[PDB]
Amino acid sequence: KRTLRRLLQERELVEPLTPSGEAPNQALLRILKETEFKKIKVLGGTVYKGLWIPEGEVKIPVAIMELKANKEILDEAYVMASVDNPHVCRLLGICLTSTVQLITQLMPFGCLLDYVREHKDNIGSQYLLNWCVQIAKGMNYLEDRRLVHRDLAARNVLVKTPQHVKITDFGVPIKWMALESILHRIYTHQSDVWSYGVTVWELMTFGSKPYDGIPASEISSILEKGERLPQPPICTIDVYMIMVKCWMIDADSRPKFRELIIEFSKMARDPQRYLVIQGDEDSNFYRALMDVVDADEYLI
Amino acid sequence: KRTLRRLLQERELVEPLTPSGEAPNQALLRILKETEFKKIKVLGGTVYKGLWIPEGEVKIPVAIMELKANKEILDEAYVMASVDNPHVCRLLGICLTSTVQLITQLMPFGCLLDYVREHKDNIGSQYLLNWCVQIAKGMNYLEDRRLVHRDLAARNVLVKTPQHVKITDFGVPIKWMALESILHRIYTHQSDVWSYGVTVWELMTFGSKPYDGIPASEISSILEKGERLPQPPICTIDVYMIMVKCWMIDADSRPKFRELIIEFSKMARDPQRYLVIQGDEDSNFYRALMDVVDADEYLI
């Protein structure tokens, strides 16, 4: 049967087996034909707001990134398709035209920042607190996959429905950056916590601009002298205390996303105790385009 | 609409509501830039006497506590900002420099102990008795929030104006301690009453030192054999009787702050009957620095 000599020969035919027991990545990469989607507005190669429209079957909010250095575009695609979290946006598909194109989902109700500005007077404490939980949960999932977002902000969270938000794909914003990021270009999950802190502030102020009319060049110094974004009028000191902690100069002084989840959860369990909003007791983007069906809800 | 299945799903999006009806803590935590205040003298990480000086708008007496173990500094800040009483000092703000800094108010006329020494011959019974009411009222407020001061003393009361005093922030003094505190390190509101008793004595003696030149090591025994601080010459036995009661060995024998308020109130209503002072019928600290405007009076 199998002599030692024959066994060597087949080493040329069968690679030696060394099972890692690592989990197979079964993420789906859908290829989409160009005709199936239309571009409507330009958002930024370049990025278009557009709809995806499968032949026969529904119009789906998509962002289309049209950008050789194709190892780059395909590798980004790989990680973008791989994320599976209810609060993180997933790659829809790609289009392999001469200029390869990335298709990511956009939510029917737009970016959260626009949403709080429009719905300023009609947003109760429950909605705000639960959004923070969800944002932490998405960031925490990213921590677990060892992905640093590097640009978490209210404009980068999208409204799937009023009670569901998702962090939009990562593809320099001084006023959201950690001090170490500004000074030494260091980016870590703890630098992301600082950014989460700022974004929470944006929500609580209903879309105020951070550090308004202060030059970017000055932000670094203001931070070192210990000024931080001010307490929002609706925020009990309990809530505000969490924001502040996220802006400690020492990255390890800041809380972790797993901690933040627990903290904001407890608050969402009793929202009127932690946020005081007077009278507490669709959107412009939604009316722009508009079926206008979100991708998650269309597929799987 | 909302099936039971959908309702479960959203439990992942909306935390279950369980309203406590507890009062939201709306205390303000102000962040201050380092440039805005200067340190002048060292009082004690370390503590500096200094002024706070807002850009544009006033120079405010502040103590600056410059002290990782930042969960500690921030938690103390939380409770310090939360107190709202006319006779208890409140946190001014913090500064989030790499070494986090606490800023608490200091009164324009300094500590009460220095005040009675300087103004020894010009302090009538009215002033002394009303100060005691105010000290009880502050301690009583602390009782209500379930905060044990642990170091109430004349040096720890500050003169806002001659008719207004405030207990300075809590941030071992054997000669002011209760017997149980010395023996077993037990601290309670009733241990604070003993300390109030001693501090009242300091005022009535115009700043005499308690147990003078007796070793601390001996104080415990002297107490058990039933010696206590002597009757001050200006004190009727009525006043002195209250001090003595505060030094009962059994903590529950001692009066309560709510009782003390009533008692000293009655005396302040007729001061010449309870304190005999002959001729009854600014400061050094105030002249040190020196607008020199107290914080309460600057803000809200």
Coordinates of C-alpha atoms in Angstrom, one line a residue:
Chain A
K1 CA 0.0 0.0 0.0
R2 CA 1.4 3.4 1.1
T3 CA 5.2 3.0 1.3
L4 CA 7.2 5.9 2.8
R5 CA 8.6 6.6 -0.7
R6 CA 5.0 6.9 -2.2
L7 CA 4.1 9.1 0.7
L8 CA 6.8 11.5 -0.1
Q9 CA 5.7 11.6 -3.8
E10 CA 2.2 12.5 -2.9
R11 CA 3.4 15.4 -0.9
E12 CA 3.7 16.9 -4.4
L13 CA 0.0 16.2 -4.9
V14 CA -1.5 16.7 -1.4
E15 CA -0.5 19.6 0.8
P16 CA 0.3 18.6 4.4
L17 CA -2.8 18.9 6.6
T18 CA -2.6 21.4 9.6
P19 CA -6.2 22.3 10.7
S20 CA -6.4 25.6 12.6
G21 CA -10.0 25.0 13.8
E22 CA -10.5 28.6 12.9
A23 CA -14.1 29.6 11.9
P24 CA -14.7 29.7 8.1
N25 CA -15.7 33.2 6.9
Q26 CA -19.0 32.5 5.1
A27 CA -19.8 36.1 4.3
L28 CA -21.5 36.7 0.9
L29 CA -20.0 38.9 -1.8
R30 CA -22.8 39.8 -4.3
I31 CA -21.8 41.0 -7.7
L32 CA -24.3 43.5 -9.2
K33 CA -24.7 44.6 -12.8
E34 CA -24.4 48.4 -13.4
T35 CA -27.8 48.8 -15.1
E36 CA -29.4 47.6 -11.7
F37 CA -28.6 50.8 -9.9
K38 CA -28.9 54.5 -10.7
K39 CA -26.8 57.4 -9.2
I40 CA -28.8 60.5 -8.3
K41 CA -26.6 62.9 -6.3
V42 CA -22.9 63.1 -5.7
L43 CA -21.6 62.9 -2.1
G44 CA -17.8 63.0 -2.7
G45 CA -12.4 58.3 -6.8
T46 CA -16.0 59.6 -6.0
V47 CA -19.1 58.6 -4.0
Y48 CA -22.8 58.9 -5.1
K49 CA -26.0 58.7 -3.3
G50 CA -28.2 56.3 -5.3
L51 CA -30.8 53.5 -5.5
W52 CA -30.3 49.8 -6.2
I53 CA -33.2 48.4 -8.3
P54 CA -33.2 44.6 -9.0
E55 CA -34.8 43.6 -12.3
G56 CA -38.3 42.3 -11.7
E57 CA -38.5 42.6 -7.9
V58 CA -38.2 47.5 -4.6
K59 CA -35.8 50.5 -4.5
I60 CA -32.9 50.4 -2.0
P61 CA -30.9 53.2 -0.6
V62 CA -27.3 52.6 -1.5
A63 CA -24.1 54.5 -1.5
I64 CA -21.9 53.8 -4.6
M65 CA -18.2 54.2 -4.2
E66 CA -16.5 54.6 -7.7
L67 CA -12.7 54.8 -7.1
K68 CA -3.9 49.2 -10.8
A69 CA -4.5 49.8 -7.0
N70 CA -7.5 47.4 -7.1
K71 CA -5.9 45.2 -4.4
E72 CA -7.0 48.1 -2.2
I73 CA -10.6 48.4 -3.3
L74 CA -11.1 44.6 -3.1
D75 CA -9.5 44.2 0.3
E76 CA -11.7 47.0 1.8
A77 CA -14.6 45.1 0.2
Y78 CA -13.6 41.9 2.0
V79 CA -13.7 43.4 5.5
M80 CA -16.9 45.4 4.6
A81 CA -18.7 42.3 3.6
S82 CA -17.5 40.5 6.6
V83 CA -19.1 42.5 9.3
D84 CA -22.3 41.1 10.8
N85 CA -23.9 43.3 13.4
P86 CA -27.4 44.8 13.7
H87 CA -25.9 48.3 14.3
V88 CA -23.1 48.3 11.7
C89 CA -23.7 48.9 8.0
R90 CA -22.8 46.0 5.6
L91 CA -21.5 46.0 2.1
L92 CA -24.3 45.4 -0.4
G93 CA -22.3 44.1 -3.3
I94 CA -19.7 45.2 -5.8
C95 CA -19.7 45.9 -9.5
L96 CA -16.7 44.7 -11.5
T97 CA -16.7 47.4 -14.2
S98 CA -13.3 48.5 -15.4
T99 CA -13.5 50.9 -12.5
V100 CA -14.5 48.6 -9.7
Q101 CA -17.5 49.9 -7.6
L102 CA -18.5 49.3 -4.0
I103 CA -22.1 49.4 -3.0
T104 CA -23.0 49.9 0.7
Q105 CA -26.4 50.4 2.2
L106 CA -27.9 53.7 3.2
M107 CA -30.8 54.0 5.6
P108 CA -34.2 55.3 4.5
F109 CA -34.2 58.1 7.2
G110 CA -30.7 59.5 6.6
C111 CA -27.9 60.4 9.0
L112 CA -28.7 60.8 12.7
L113 CA -27.2 64.3 12.9
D114 CA -29.7 65.6 10.4
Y115 CA -32.4 63.7 12.2
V116 CA -31.9 65.3 15.6
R117 CA -31.9 68.8 14.0
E118 CA -35.2 68.1 12.2
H119 CA -36.8 66.3 15.1
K120 CA -35.2 68.5 17.8
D121 CA -38.5 69.1 19.7
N122 CA -40.0 65.7 19.3
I123 CA -37.3 63.5 20.6
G124 CA -37.8 62.0 24.1
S125 CA -35.1 60.6 26.5
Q126 CA -35.9 57.1 25.7
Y127 CA -35.0 57.5 22.0
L128 CA -31.8 59.3 22.7
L129 CA -30.5 56.9 25.4
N130 CA -31.3 53.7 23.4
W131 CA -29.5 55.2 20.4
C132 CA -26.4 55.5 22.6
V133 CA -26.7 51.8 23.6
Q134 CA -26.8 50.8 20.0
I135 CA -23.9 52.9 19.0
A136 CA -21.8 51.4 21.7
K137 CA -22.9 47.9 20.7
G138 CA -21.8 48.5 17.1
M139 CA -18.5 50.0 18.2
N140 CA -18.1 47.1 20.6
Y141 CA -18.6 44.6 17.9
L142 CA -15.9 46.5 15.9
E143 CA -13.6 46.2 19.0
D144 CA -14.1 42.5 19.0
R145 CA -13.1 42.2 15.3
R146 CA -10.2 44.5 16.1
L147 CA -11.4 47.2 13.7
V148 CA -10.7 50.9 14.6
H149 CA -13.4 53.0 13.0
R150 CA -11.3 56.3 13.2
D151 CA -14.2 58.6 12.3
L152 CA -17.2 57.9 14.5
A153 CA -19.7 60.8 14.4
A154 CA -23.4 61.7 14.4
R155 CA -23.2 62.2 10.6
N156 CA -21.8 58.7 10.5
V157 CA -24.7 57.0 12.1
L158 CA -27.8 56.2 10.0
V159 CA -31.5 55.9 11.0
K160 CA -32.9 52.5 9.8
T161 CA -36.1 53.3 11.8
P162 CA -36.6 55.7 14.7
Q163 CA -35.6 52.9 17.1
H164 CA -32.8 51.4 15.1
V165 CA -29.5 53.1 14.2
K166 CA -26.4 51.8 12.4
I167 CA -22.8 53.1 12.2
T168 CA -22.1 53.7 8.6
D169 CA -19.1 52.2 6.9
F170 CA -15.7 53.8 7.4
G171 CA -15.1 54.8 3.8
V172 CA -9.2 64.2 9.4
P173 CA -12.1 65.3 11.7
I174 CA -10.2 67.3 14.4
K175 CA -13.2 68.1 16.5
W176 CA -14.1 64.5 17.1
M177 CA -10.5 63.3 17.5
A178 CA -8.7 62.2 20.7
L179 CA -5.7 64.3 21.8
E180 CA -3.3 61.4 21.0
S181 CA -4.8 61.1 17.5
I182 CA -4.2 64.8 16.8
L183 CA -0.8 64.9 18.3
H184 CA 0.8 61.6 17.2
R185 CA -1.7 60.2 14.7
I186 CA -2.3 57.2 17.1
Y187 CA -5.6 55.5 16.5
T188 CA -7.1 52.9 18.9
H189 CA -10.4 51.6 20.1
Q190 CA -9.9 54.1 23.0
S191 CA -9.4 56.9 20.5
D192 CA -12.8 55.7 19.2
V193 CA -14.3 56.1 22.7
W194 CA -13.4 59.8 22.6
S195 CA -15.1 60.0 19.3
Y196 CA -18.2 58.2 20.8
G197 CA -18.1 60.7 23.6
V198 CA -18.3 63.6 21.1
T199 CA -21.0 62.0 19.1
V200 CA -23.1 61.4 22.2
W201 CA -22.8 65.1 22.8
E202 CA -24.0 65.9 19.4
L203 CA -27.2 63.9 20.0
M204 CA -27.8 65.4 23.4
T205 CA -27.5 69.0 22.0
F206 CA -29.7 68.0 19.1
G207 CA -27.0 68.6 16.5
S208 CA -24.9 71.4 17.8
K209 CA -21.5 71.7 16.2
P210 CA -18.6 70.7 18.5
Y211 CA -16.1 73.5 19.4
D212 CA -17.9 76.0 17.1
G213 CA -15.9 78.6 15.3
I214 CA -12.8 77.6 17.1
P215 CA -9.9 76.9 14.7
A216 CA -8.8 73.3 14.4
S217 CA -5.3 74.4 15.0
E218 CA -6.3 75.6 18.4
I219 CA -8.2 72.4 19.5
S220 CA -5.2 70.5 20.6
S221 CA -4.1 73.2 23.2
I222 CA -7.6 73.7 24.5
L223 CA -7.7 70.0 25.2
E224 CA -4.3 70.0 27.1
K225 CA -5.5 72.9 29.3
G226 CA -8.5 70.7 30.2
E227 CA -11.4 72.4 28.5
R228 CA -14.0 70.0 27.1
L229 CA -17.4 70.2 25.4
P230 CA -20.0 71.7 27.8
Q231 CA -22.8 70.0 29.7
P232 CA -26.0 69.9 27.5
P233 CA -29.0 71.4 29.2
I234 CA -31.0 68.2 29.1
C235 CA -28.3 66.0 30.6
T236 CA -28.2 65.1 34.2
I237 CA -24.6 65.1 35.6
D238 CA -24.9 61.3 35.5
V239 CA -25.0 61.3 31.7
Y240 CA -22.6 64.1 31.4
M241 CA -20.1 62.4 33.6
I242 CA -19.9 59.5 31.1
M243 CA -19.1 62.0 28.2
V244 CA -16.4 63.6 30.3
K245 CA -14.7 60.3 31.1
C246 CA -14.5 59.5 27.4
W247 CA -12.3 62.6 27.2
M248 CA -9.7 61.8 29.7
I249 CA -6.2 62.5 28.4
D250 CA -5.1 59.1 29.3
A251 CA -6.7 56.6 26.9
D252 CA -6.8 53.9 29.5
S253 CA -8.6 56.3 31.9
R254 CA -11.6 56.2 29.4
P255 CA -14.4 53.7 29.7
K256 CA -14.7 50.7 27.3
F257 CA -17.5 50.1 24.9
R258 CA -18.6 47.0 26.8
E259 CA -18.9 49.3 29.9
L260 CA -20.7 51.9 28.0
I261 CA -23.2 49.5 26.8
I262 CA -24.1 48.6 30.4
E263 CA -24.1 52.2 31.6
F264 CA -26.5 53.5 28.9
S265 CA -28.6 50.4 29.2
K266 CA -29.3 51.2 32.8
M267 CA -30.3 54.7 31.8
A268 CA -32.5 53.6 29.0
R269 CA -34.3 51.4 31.6
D270 CA -35.3 54.6 33.4
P271 CA -34.8 57.4 30.8
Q272 CA -36.7 60.3 32.5
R273 CA -34.3 60.0 35.4
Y274 CA -31.2 60.7 33.4
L275 CA -32.4 63.1 30.7
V276 CA -34.8 66.0 31.4
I277 CA -36.6 67.1 28.2
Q278 CA -39.6 69.4 28.4
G279 CA -42.8 67.7 27.2
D280 CA -41.0 64.3 27.6
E281 CA -43.8 61.9 28.6
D282 CA -40.3 60.6 8.4
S283 CA -37.3 62.9 7.6
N284 CA -36.0 65.2 4.9
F285 CA -33.8 62.4 3.4
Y286 CA -36.8 60.0 3.6
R287 CA -38.8 62.4 1.5
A288 CA -36.0 63.0 -1.0
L289 CA -36.2 59.5 -2.5
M290 CA -39.8 58.4 -2.2
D291 CA -41.2 51.3 -2.5
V292 CA -38.1 52.7 -0.7
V293 CA -37.0 49.5 1.1
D294 CA -33.9 49.1 3.3
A295 CA -31.5 46.3 2.3
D296 CA -31.6 44.3 5.5
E297 CA -35.3 44.1 5.3
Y298 CA -35.2 43.2 1.5
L299 CA -32.6 40.3 1.9
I300 CA -32.1 37.7 4.7
Chain B
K1 CA -48.8 45.6 13.8
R2 CA -46.7 44.5 16.8
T3 CA -46.8 40.7 17.0
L4 CA -45.3 39.0 20.1
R5 CA -42.3 37.9 17.9
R6 CA -41.6 41.5 16.8
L7 CA -41.9 42.6 20.3
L8 CA -39.2 40.2 21.4
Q9 CA -36.9 41.4 18.6
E10 CA -37.2 45.0 19.6
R11 CA -36.1 44.1 23.1
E12 CA -32.7 44.0 21.5
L13 CA -33.3 47.7 20.4
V14 CA -35.4 49.1 23.3
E15 CA -34.4 48.4 26.9
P16 CA -37.5 47.4 29.0
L17 CA -39.0 50.5 30.8
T18 CA -39.0 50.5 34.6
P19 CA -39.5 54.1 35.9
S20 CA -38.2 54.7 39.4
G21 CA -39.8 58.1 39.8
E22 CA -36.6 59.1 41.4
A23 CA -35.6 62.8 41.1
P24 CA -33.2 63.5 38.2
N25 CA -29.8 65.0 39.4
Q26 CA -29.6 68.2 37.4
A27 CA -26.4 69.5 39.1
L28 CA -23.9 71.4 36.8
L29 CA -20.4 70.2 36.2
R30 CA -18.4 73.1 34.7
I31 CA -15.2 72.4 32.9
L32 CA -12.6 75.2 33.2
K33 CA -9.5 75.9 31.2
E34 CA -6.2 76.0 33.1
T35 CA -5.2 79.5 32.0
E36 CA -8.4 80.9 33.6
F37 CA -7.1 80.4 37.1
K38 CA -3.8 81.1 38.9
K39 CA -2.4 79.4 42.0
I40 CA -0.9 81.7 44.6
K41 CA -0.1 79.8 47.8
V42 CA 0.2 76.1 48.6
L43 CA -2.2 74.7 51.2
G44 CA -1.2 71.0 51.1
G45 CA -1.6 65.2 45.2
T46 CA -1.5 68.9 46.5
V47 CA -3.9 71.8 47.2
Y48 CA -3.4 75.5 46.3
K49 CA -5.1 78.6 47.4
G50 CA -5.8 80.5 44.2
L51 CA -8.1 82.8 42.1
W52 CA -10.5 81.9 39.3
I53 CA -10.5 84.6 36.6
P54 CA -13.0 84.2 33.6
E55 CA -11.7 85.8 30.3
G56 CA -13.5 89.1 29.7
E57 CA -15.7 89.2 32.9
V58 CA -14.1 89.4 38.6
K59 CA -11.6 87.3 40.7
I60 CA -13.0 84.4 42.6
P61 CA -11.6 82.7 45.7
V62 CA -11.0 79.1 44.8
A63 CA -9.2 76.1 46.2
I64 CA -7.5 74.0 43.5
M65 CA -7.0 70.3 44.3
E66 CA -4.3 68.8 41.9
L67 CA -4.1 65.1 42.8
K68 CA -5.0 55.7 36.8
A69 CA -7.0 56.3 40.0
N70 CA -9.1 59.0 38.2
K71 CA -12.4 57.0 39.0
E72 CA -11.7 58.4 42.5
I73 CA -11.2 62.0 41.6
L74 CA -14.3 62.1 39.4
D75 CA -16.5 60.3 41.8
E76 CA -15.6 62.8 44.6
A77 CA -16.4 65.5 42.0
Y78 CA -19.8 64.0 41.4
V79 CA -20.9 64.3 45.0
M80 CA -19.2 67.7 45.5
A81 CA -21.1 69.2 42.6
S82 CA -24.3 67.7 43.8
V83 CA -24.7 69.5 47.1
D84 CA -27.1 72.3 47.1
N85 CA -27.3 74.1 50.4
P86 CA -26.7 77.7 51.4
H87 CA -24.3 76.6 54.2
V88 CA -22.3 74.0 52.4
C89 CA -19.6 74.7 49.9
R90 CA -20.1 73.6 46.3
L91 CA -17.6 72.4 43.6
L92 CA -16.9 75.2 41.2
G93 CA -15.8 73.1 38.2
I94 CA -13.0 70.8 37.2
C95 CA -10.1 71.0 34.8
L96 CA -9.4 67.9 32.6
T97 CA -5.6 68.3 32.3
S98 CA -3.6 65.1 32.3
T99 CA -3.7 65.5 36.1
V100 CA -7.4 66.1 36.7
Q101 CA -8.0 69.2 38.9
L102 CA -10.9 70.0 41.3
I103 CA -11.9 73.6 41.8
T104 CA -14.0 74.4 45.0
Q105 CA -15.0 77.8 46.3
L106 CA -13.2 79.7 49.1
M107 CA -14.9 82.5 50.9
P108 CA -13.6 86.1 50.7
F109 CA -13.2 86.4 54.6
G110 CA -11.4 83.0 55.2
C111 CA -11.9 80.4 57.8
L112 CA -14.1 81.0 60.8
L113 CA -11.4 80.0 63.3
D114 CA -9.0 82.7 62.1
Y115 CA -12.0 85.1 62.1
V116 CA -12.9 84.7 65.8
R117 CA -9.2 85.1 66.7
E118 CA -9.0 88.4 64.7
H119 CA -12.4 89.7 65.7
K120 CA -12.3 88.3 69.3
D121 CA -13.4 91.6 71.0
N122 CA -15.8 92.6 68.4
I123 CA -18.1 89.6 68.2
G124 CA -21.5 89.9 69.8
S125 CA -23.8 87.0 71.0
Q126 CA -26.1 87.4 68.0
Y127 CA -23.3 86.6 65.5
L128 CA -22.0 83.6 67.4
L129 CA -25.4 82.0 68.0
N130 CA -26.6 82.5 64.3
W131 CA -23.4 80.9 63.0
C132 CA -24.2 77.8 65.1
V133 CA -27.6 77.7 63.5
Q134 CA -26.1 77.8 60.1
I135 CA -23.5 75.2 60.9
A136 CA -26.3 72.8 62.1
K137 CA -28.3 73.5 59.0
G138 CA -25.5 72.6 56.7
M139 CA -24.7 69.5 58.7
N140 CA -28.4 68.6 58.7
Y141 CA -28.5 68.9 55.0
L142 CA -25.6 66.6 54.8
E143 CA -27.5 64.1 57.1
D144 CA -30.4 64.2 54.7
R145 CA -28.1 63.2 51.8
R146 CA -26.5 60.6 54.1
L147 CA -23.1 62.2 53.9
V148 CA -20.8 61.9 57.0
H149 CA -18.4 64.9 57.0
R150 CA -15.9 63.2 59.3
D151 CA -13.9 66.5 59.9
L152 CA -16.1 69.3 61.0
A153 CA -14.1 72.0 62.7
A154 CA -13.9 75.8 63.0
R155 CA -11.0 75.8 60.4
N156 CA -13.5 74.0 58.1
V157 CA -16.2 76.7 58.2
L158 CA -15.7 79.7 55.9
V159 CA -17.0 83.3 56.2
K160 CA -18.9 84.3 53.1
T161 CA -20.0 87.5 54.9
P162 CA -20.1 88.2 58.6
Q163 CA -23.7 86.8 58.8
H164 CA -23.2 83.9 56.4
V165 CA -21.0 80.9 57.0
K166 CA -20.5 77.7 54.9
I167 CA -19.0 74.3 55.8
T168 CA -16.1 73.7 53.5
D169 CA -15.8 70.6 51.5
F170 CA -14.6 67.4 53.0
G171 CA -11.4 67.1 50.9
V172 CA -7.2 62.2 61.6
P173 CA -8.2 65.1 63.9
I174 CA -8.2 63.4 67.3
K175 CA -9.2 66.5 69.3
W176 CA -12.5 66.8 67.4
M177 CA -13.2 63.1 67.1
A178 CA -15.9 61.1 68.9
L179 CA -14.7 58.4 71.3
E180 CA -16.1 55.7 69.0
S181 CA -14.3 57.2 66.1
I182 CA -11.0 57.2 67.9
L183 CA -11.5 53.7 69.3
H184 CA -13.0 51.8 66.4
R185 CA -12.8 54.2 63.4
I186 CA -16.7 54.3 63.4
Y187 CA -18.0 57.4 61.7
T188 CA -21.6 58.4 61.7
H189 CA -23.7 61.6 61.7
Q190 CA -23.7 61.2 65.5
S191 CA -19.9 61.2 65.4
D192 CA -20.3 64.5 63.4
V193 CA -22.4 65.9 66.3
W194 CA -19.5 65.4 68.6
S195 CA -17.4 67.3 66.2
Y196 CA -20.0 70.0 65.9
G197 CA -19.9 70.2 69.7
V198 CA -16.2 70.8 69.7
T199 CA -16.4 73.4 66.9
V200 CA -19.1 75.3 68.8
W201 CA -16.6 75.4 71.7
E202 CA -13.9 76.8 69.5
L203 CA -16.2 79.7 68.5
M204 CA -17.3 80.4 72.1
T205 CA -13.7 80.5 73.2
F206 CA -12.8 82.8 70.3
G207 CA -10.4 80.2 68.8
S208 CA -8.9 78.4 71.8
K209 CA -7.3 75.1 70.9
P210 CA -9.2 72.0 72.2
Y211 CA -7.3 69.9 74.8
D212 CA -4.2 72.1 74.6
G213 CA -0.8 70.4 74.9
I214 CA -2.4 67.1 75.9
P215 CA -1.0 64.3 73.8
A216 CA -3.5 62.8 71.2
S217 CA -2.6 59.4 72.6
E218 CA -4.0 60.4 76.0
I219 CA -7.3 62.0 74.6
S220 CA -9.2 58.7 74.4
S221 CA -8.6 57.9 78.2
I222 CA -9.5 61.4 79.4
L223 CA -12.7 61.0 77.5
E224 CA -13.6 57.6 79.1
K225 CA -13.0 59.0 82.6
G226 CA -15.5 61.7 81.7
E227 CA -13.5 64.8 81.4
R228 CA -14.7 67.1 78.6
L229 CA -13.8 70.6 77.3
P230 CA -14.5 73.3 79.9
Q231 CA -17.4 75.8 80.1
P232 CA -16.4 79.0 78.1
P233 CA -16.7 82.2 80.3
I234 CA -19.3 83.8 78.0
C235 CA -21.6 80.7 77.9
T236 CA -24.6 80.5 80.1
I237 CA -25.1 76.9 81.4
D238 CA -27.9 76.6 78.8
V239 CA -25.5 76.9 75.9
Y240 CA -22.9 74.8 77.6
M241 CA -25.4 72.1 78.3
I242 CA -25.8 71.6 74.6
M243 CA -22.1 71.2 74.0
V244 CA -21.9 68.6 76.8
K245 CA -24.7 66.6 75.4
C246 CA -22.9 66.4 72.1
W247 CA -20.1 64.6 74.0
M248 CA -22.1 61.8 75.5
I249 CA -20.3 58.5 75.2
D250 CA -23.4 56.9 73.8
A251 CA -23.9 58.3 70.2
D252 CA -27.6 58.0 70.5
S253 CA -27.6 60.0 73.8
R254 CA -26.3 63.0 71.7
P255 CA -28.8 65.5 70.1
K256 CA -29.5 65.5 66.4
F257 CA -28.8 68.3 63.9
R258 CA -32.5 68.9 63.4
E259 CA -32.8 69.4 67.2
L260 CA -29.7 71.6 67.3
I261 CA -31.1 73.8 64.7
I262 CA -34.2 74.5 66.8
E263 CA -32.3 74.9 70.0
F264 CA -29.8 77.5 68.7
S265 CA -32.5 79.2 66.8
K266 CA -34.3 79.9 70.0
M267 CA -31.2 81.3 71.5
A268 CA -30.4 83.4 68.5
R269 CA -33.9 84.9 69.0
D270 CA -32.8 86.2 72.3
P271 CA -29.0 86.2 72.2
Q272 CA -28.0 88.3 75.2
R273 CA -29.9 85.9 77.5
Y274 CA -27.7 82.9 76.5
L275 CA -24.3 84.5 75.9
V276 CA -22.8 87.2 78.1
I277 CA -20.2 89.2 76.3
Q278 CA -18.9 92.5 77.8
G279 CA -19.7 95.4 75.6
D280 CA -22.3 93.3 73.8
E281 CA -25.2 95.7 72.8
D282 CA -12.8 92.7 56.8
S283 CA -10.2 90.0 57.8
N284 CA -6.5 89.1 57.3
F285 CA -7.5 86.6 54.5
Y286 CA -9.7 89.3 52.9
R287 CA -6.8 91.7 52.7
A288 CA -4.4 88.9 51.4
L289 CA -6.2 88.7 48.0
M290 CA -7.6 92.3 47.3
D291 CA -12.9 92.8 42.4
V292 CA -12.7 89.8 44.8
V293 CA -16.1 88.3 44.3
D294 CA -17.5 85.1 45.9
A295 CA -18.7 82.4 43.4
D296 CA -22.3 82.1 44.6
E297 CA -22.7 85.8 44.1
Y298 CA -21.0 85.6 40.6
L299 CA -23.1 82.8 39.2
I300 CA -26.8 81.9 39.7

